[PDB]
Amino acid sequence: RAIDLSRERDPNFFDHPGIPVPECFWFMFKNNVRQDAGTCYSSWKMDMKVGPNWVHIKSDDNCNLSGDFPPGWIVLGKKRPGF
């Protein structure tokens, strides 16, 4: 059951052509079980619904994500292949 982002399938994403290509993939888990996944920018921020809560999630230059996640939940990031 443990989280292993090296074995996670890529998210189902779309690189919108009118904005820069986001550098990161994020993965959301509840009790270490994948709930969803997507793309996000490095060195940036987003508001995301994580279980019951709105959570402000910051990303660093290496796609590490930080936020105050509700009990049982986490969102983790990694760099995309070309980035």
Partner: protein, 73 residues
């Protein structure tokens, strides 16, 4: 996202309703692009300028089916 454009992600209850939701979002003023994304292909990601996400939620609920805002960036 960085720059002038907004990205929002909305989950819509879609079971006909899929095309209806996409068409509604795509018809909205200020929209540059719309995509169905997510592990269950049940989330619509919208990019553009001058889009009010809360009005979009209300419009989807009135015209299509339940809708929930999941991300703003």
């Amino acid at each position: 996202g960085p720059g002038l454009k907004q990205k929002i992600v909305i989950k819509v209850a879609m079971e006909n309703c899929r095309s209806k939701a996409m068409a509604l979002v795509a018809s909205t003023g200020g929209v540059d692009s719309v995509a169905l994304v997510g592990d269950l292909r049940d989330k619509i990601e919208v990019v553009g300028y001058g889009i009010d996400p809360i009005k979009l939620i209300s419009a989807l609920r009135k015209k299509v089916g339940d809708a929930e805002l999941l991300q703003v960036s």
